[PDB]
Amino acid sequence: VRLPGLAAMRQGTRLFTPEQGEDLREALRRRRGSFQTTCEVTSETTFAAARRLREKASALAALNFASAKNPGGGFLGGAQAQEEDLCRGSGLYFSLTSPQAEPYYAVNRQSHSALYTDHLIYSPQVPIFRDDAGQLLPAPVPVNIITAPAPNAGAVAQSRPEQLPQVLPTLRERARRVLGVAAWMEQTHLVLGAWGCGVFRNDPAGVARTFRELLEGEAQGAFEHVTFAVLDNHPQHPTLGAFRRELESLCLP
Ligand SMILES: Nc1ncnc2c1ncn2[C@@H]1O[C@H](COP(=O)(O)OP(=O)(O)OC[C@H]2O[C@H](O)[C@H](O)[C@@H]2O)[C@@H](O)[C@H]1O
């Protein structure tokens, strides 16, 4: 008994390949300067912020902090993983397992680099069915989802230390492509966050500054509103705190 909205989502799912990198930058150029971009850092989950923004804006997309190699990351290592949260509360997994998304996983596996490749998946109108607590929503809230894997810094450290200088450059260019996909699909509202900063062991300050520099440069004014929704259950909030400090100059009113 296939849930409503999932067929259209799977059908509409789209693969972006590394060779489309220049078209993704063209999308950014087309959208730059469209808005006086506002942004904020919150302690919300991805879907809580998405649900909040979706009530004001239809053209809303959220970033999935994706595995490169298995849809939903195989649900291994802990449910404290953002992609697992996304796949337990929405139709995302049925999108990520679509046939047209297959090369993302095949090529990333064949790559044998923990930097991974610049494949991205765009899932349109993924219905969110449940809230943060697993309770049913009064109505499913469909959001667009951009799936891209941050480079796996922790794996790089253990296997190819000579590639450690390429982790942040890889992160930066793939983040640019994430924004390019949103620009290509004319998204006005984005939910970003601490991409690569948990399981993949990237430094949160460096990730926050990477997004800030893109929003001040090649992605300047391309979006109407960006929320950095950073779940951080540690009482000292080292990850939320890093994003708040690196993005404060930007996200002031
Ligand atoms: N629902 C959530 N919403 C918003 N932020 C979250 C959420 N959950 C965690 N965070 C915060 O975001 C930070 C990073 O969340 P992470 O999920 O580790 O993303 P990664 O890119 O480093 O690892 C991706 C792998 O982990 C998965 O297994 C995938 O399948 C991949 O294999 C966390 O530390 C939290 O501060």
Residue numbers in the entry: 29 to 281
Question: What does the published report state?
Answer:
Despite the abundance of PARP1, most of the PAR generated by DNA damage is rapidly degraded, with a half-life of less than 1 min by poly (ADP-ribose) glycohydrolase (PARG). The radio-resistant bacterium D. radiodurans encodes a PARG homolog, DrPARG, whose expression is upregulated after radiation damage, so it might play an important role in DNA repair. Our study demonstrates that DrPARG is involved in catalyzing the breakdown of endogenous PAR and DNA repair in D. radiodurans. From observing the structural peculiarities of DrPARG, we show that although previously thought to be an obligate exo-glycohydrolase, bacterial PARG could exert both exo- and endo-glycohydrolase functions.
